[PDB]
Amino acid sequence: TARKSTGGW
Amino acid sequence: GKLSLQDVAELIRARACQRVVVMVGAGISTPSGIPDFRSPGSGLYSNLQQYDLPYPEAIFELPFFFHNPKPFFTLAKELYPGNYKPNVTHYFLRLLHDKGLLLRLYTQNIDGLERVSGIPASKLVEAHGTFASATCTVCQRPFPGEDIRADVMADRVPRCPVCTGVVKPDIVFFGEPLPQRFLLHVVDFPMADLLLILGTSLEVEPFASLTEAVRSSVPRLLINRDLVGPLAWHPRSRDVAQLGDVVHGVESLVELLGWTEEMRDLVQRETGKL
Numbered sequence: 354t355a356r357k358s359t360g361g362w
Numbered sequence: 363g364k365l366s367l368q369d370v371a372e373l374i375r376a377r378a379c380q381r382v383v384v385m386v387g388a389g390i391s392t393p394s395g396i397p398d399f400r401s402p403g404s405g406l407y408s409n410l411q412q413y414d415l416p417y418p419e420a421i422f423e424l425p426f427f428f429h430n431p432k433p434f435f436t437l438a439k440e441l442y443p444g445n446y447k448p449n450v451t452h453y454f455l456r457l458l459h460d461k462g463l464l465l466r467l468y469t470q471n472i473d474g475l476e477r478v479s480g481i482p483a484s485k486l487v488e489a490h491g492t493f494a495s496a497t498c499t500v501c502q503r504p505f506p507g508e509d510i511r512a513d514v515m516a517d518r519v520p521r522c523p524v525c526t527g528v529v530k531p532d533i534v535f536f537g538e539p540l541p542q543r544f545l546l547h548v549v550d551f552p553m554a555d556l557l558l559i560l561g562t563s564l565e566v567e568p569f570a571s572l573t574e575a576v577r578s579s580v581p582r583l584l585i586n587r588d589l590v591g592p593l594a595w596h597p598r599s600r601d602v603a604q605l606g607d608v609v610h611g612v613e614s615l616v617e618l619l620g621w622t623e624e625m626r627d628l629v630q631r632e633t634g635k636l
């Protein structure tokens with residue numbers, strides 16, 4: 354339930 | 363025998379690199395006037411007023427989007443394909459396509475300028491979505507992206523004709539899976555004999571890991587302000603880094619390829635079209 358990520362979340 | 367920018371230029375003109383794959387980010391869209399956060403923008407930048415974001419990235423997160431989608435659609439109005447024109451970096455990539463040297467152009471951007479410049483969809487992987495399509499967040503009915511254009515540009519939230527739910531452009535938010543078309547990298551990067559990295563700090567996964575997928579003998583050329591990502595902390599002997607201004611860096615490579623005359627003509631032919 355996720356994949357796209359950037360330094361923070 | 364480490365490679366320089368000129369050597370890479372020699373490998374294209376010598377046709378030793380015929381399957382060029384390209385990774386691009388916001389760095390190649392800044393010259394076109396496109397707003398960015400980590401580097402303030404216009405007055406619409408600080409339009410957060412009235413909008414109590416917990417942090418700027420919440421603009422691309424569903425939980426807050428459900429709470430208040432207007433911040434996103436304020437940005438969507440600005441970045442909607444039509445208000446900005448491609449720059450020299452975009453046309454350098456079509457010129458690469460017109461010479462049959464481009465395998466794919468992987469992009470983190472959603473400004474749609476890659477296709478405005480002339481690259482066909484078959485040669486693009488819009489890894490972080492597009493405004494070309496939309497989806498109702500309630501009943502999950504898909505729509506063509508232009509069915510909501512008038513609503514966005516009129517500062518009114520687009521509603522679903524079936525359930526009146528909020529219609530969301532198919533933009534990948536944080537915590538969302540990337541479009542399955544992103545899986546073409548499993549075949550494209552091994553097939554590549556050259557990798558170009560243009561204007562990105564490689565801070566967004568799983569897009570940044572793509573720098574690892576090319577075979578161990580493939581040159582990786584980085585035209586960027588900073589030395590970032592694996593080309594910084596996991597270098598390969600065949601890597602090259604033209605550090606500096608992305609436009610100046612692309613101008614340099616174009617200069618070394620002897621394509622200047624053809625770039626001038628292509629940009630003039632593309633800007634004249636109304």
Ligand SMILES: *C(=O)CCCCCCCCCCCCCCC
Nearest residue numbers: 397398399418419421472490566
């Ligand atoms: C996935 O990363 C899609 C990103 C599209 C980002 C366009 C951002 C423009 C900047 C304006 C304010 C938004 C907050 C910053 C988020 C990194």
Ligand SMILES: [Zn+2]
Nearest residue numbers: 498501522525
């Ligand atoms: Zn609906």
